[model samples]
Target: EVLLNGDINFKEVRCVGDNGEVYGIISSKEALKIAQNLGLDLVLISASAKPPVCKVMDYNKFRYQN
Candidate 1:
């Protein structure tokens, strides 16, 4: 994880394993837990990925700073 200001972000994450298969996971709830566990906030990063991608961090504060 990399920190820009007080926000946390990730460049890439290990996929559960793609195998070129399309699978849908309800990320909203999971992301919430992930962020809470990490003491961060849930931020959607890539929306074009096969399953999309989310990051755990306080992005709003970072955005506000920006």
Candidate 2:
């Protein structure tokens, strides 16, 4: 099962943009703000990394596709 809004537990993550651009590692709160600005969700794609990896995307669309 994929984690959604409010399920994230990391203090920070490596934020990747929708177009596959790396935004560099940042605090989770900052990532959430970025997602909010884009009207998307910050999804945890890789949780096992030294610093978890996350991306901003339309989570509903992602859920439907997967």
Candidate 3:
């Protein structure tokens, strides 16, 4: 199952922007704030890594392809 929005409880995560900007590792709290400011969603894409992986993107728009 994929964790969405505030459901991801990782204390730290690897952040990447929608435009492919890799933010390295950052605190989950900090990453989400930036994503909210950008009017996008923070999503968890990988769950098995040490810090996991998250990306800031238009999650709702992504669902359109489904």
Candidate 4:
């Protein structure tokens, strides 16, 4: 099995658009559940952001460039 479990950051993204909406910050546990539902993983990208930015995606496939 692949070792794809680790520390993935999460953040409160500031959506800038027509409405400019902000979502409630979620914990690592909540983020994990969300990822599972979407069939993705919580990946830490920008750690500087207010809460840090995480993308829901298959990081393993991404790492292997599949």
Candidate 5:
């Protein structure tokens, strides 16, 4: 299952932006902070990677678009 917002339980993650830009590996706290700054949610997109992949995005918008 995909985790979003406060449900993220990882200490660190590989972050990517909504624009398809990669932010490399970083602490989940920092990723969340970046998402917050962008008025978006930190979404767990690929949880099976060495460091789970997360994206800073507007959750609702992404869901509707997809």
Candidate 6:
């Protein structure tokens, strides 16, 4: 629950597109809408960082890095 999408608060976040494009800092809802529009998930990357950096991608595909 500490990882992934559901845990993030509705605060400002730094979002990255699936193609690695940064959306800069924005509201979490704004990032969520973008990710949903792209049919991807908002992934928690730097959970502890200020603004909580996240990535927009297929959750399964992002796992390829593992």
Q: Please provide TM-scores, in order, for all candidate models, with all chains considered together.
A: 0.46, 0.83, 0.83, 0.53, 0.85, 0.81
Question: Model 6 over residues 29-58: C-alpha lDDT tens digits?
Answer: 888888888888888888678878899888
Sorted by lDDT (best first), the order is 5, 2, 3, 6, 4, 1
Clashing pairs in 2: none
Put down candidate 4 lDDT per residue, 1-66, tens digits, no spaces: 222225653335322211233324666567667667767765665567776655556777556763
Best by lDDT: 5
Global local distance difference test of model 2: 0.83
lDDT of 3 at 64: 65
lDDT of each: 0.46, 0.83, 0.82, 0.52, 0.87, 0.81
Better of 3 and 5 by lDDT: 5
Model 4, residue 34: displacement in angstroms?
Answer: 0.6
Can you write out model 3's per-residue Cα lDDT over 1-66, one digit (the tens) per residue?
557678777888999987889888988888888789989888888879879898888887656634
Q: Write the per-residue lDDT of candidate 5 for residues 1-66, one digit (tens) a residue.
A: 568987887888999998888888988888988899888899988889979999998898768876
Stretches > 4 Å off in candidate 2:
none
Per-model RMSD to reference: 10.3, 1.4, 1.6, 6.6, 1.4, 1.8
Which one wins by TM-score: 2 or 4?
2
Candidate 5 wrong stretches, greater than 4 Å = none
**lDDT for 4 (candidate 3):** 66
Give the winner by TM-score. 5
Q: Alpha carbon lDDT of residue 44, candidate 2?
A: 86
User: Who is ahead in TM-score, 2 or 5?
Assistant: 5
